[PDB]
Structure 1
Amino acid sequence: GFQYKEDHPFEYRKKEGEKIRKKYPDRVPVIVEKAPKARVPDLDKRKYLVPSDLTVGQFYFLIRKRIHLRPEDALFFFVNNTIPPTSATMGQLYEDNHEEDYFLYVAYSD
């Protein structure tokens, strides 16, 4: 599973997610890591605070660039056993998929 969940016990993650949701009402907290079997670069930053209206497609645009993919290279997000559509907003994805620690978890893969 996600490295972030190894690096921090549930109770602390939940307290931090609560904190963020209180402090930043129009942002959604996202943990982003490479999928276990993906063959692409790792990012140094895993904790994201993105506008709720940001689309999944825009988030691909940002992630793709940070891992030095070309627009024509494949990239997928895995979110709770699904690939979200590009038209979904991160706010929508958060409401549908956030964990009980109040984070949304997104894996990326080629």
Structure 2
Amino acid sequence: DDFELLDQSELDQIESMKSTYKEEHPFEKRRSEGEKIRKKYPDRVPVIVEKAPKARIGDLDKKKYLVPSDLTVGQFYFLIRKRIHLRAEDALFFFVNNVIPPTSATMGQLYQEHHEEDFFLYIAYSDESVYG
């Protein structure tokens, strides 16, 4: 009948993606490490990469990556996929705040828009194209 007005704010209402890393490392320790690493490497951003709970592909043992601010999401996909156990026929998707980012985005763009108050950017991955 009538139009439905979609609002960007809806994206922000979803609950945060799971992060064992956040839960098991006290906030102040994370924030101190993130601030220090940002000062040390002004051309890089610190990223935490974790499996979405519903993902059906292999887990990732190493979570902490320091990435060039100009690396693109497509390049990051290549590098991270190399480290996960999945079939060539398995898919791989990344999520930042529950949303799949563009292949063309840079890690510095994602970091500026989405880093948390500990100065880390959190990315989840799944073989499914929805976070859960």
TM-score tier (shorter): over 0.9
For the residue of structure 2 that corresponds to 1:30, the secondary structure is: strand
Match of 2:68 among 51, 60, 69: 51
By how many angstroms is 1:44 displaced?
Answer: 1.7
Larger Rg: 2
By how many angstroms is 1:73 displaced?
Answer: 3.0
Deviation digits for residues 7-59 of structure 1 (CA, Å, limit 9, x no counterpart): 21111111111011111110110000001111111122100001111000011
Task: Give the alignment's TM-score, normalised by structure 1.
Answer: 0.93
Q: Percent identity?
A: 85
4+ runs of 1 displaced by more than 2 Å?
68-73
By how many angstroms is 1:72 displaced?
Answer: 5.2
Task: Give the alignment's TM-score, normalised by structure 2.
Answer: 0.79
CA contact (8 A) 2:73 2:106 kept: yes
Distance 2:121 2:94 in 1: 12
- Please provide the CA RMSD for this pair: 1.3
By how many angstroms is 1:101 displaced?
Answer: 0.6
How many equivalent pairs are there? 110
| Structure 1 residue ranges without an equivalent (≥5) | none
CA contact (8 A) 1:33 1:107 kept: yes
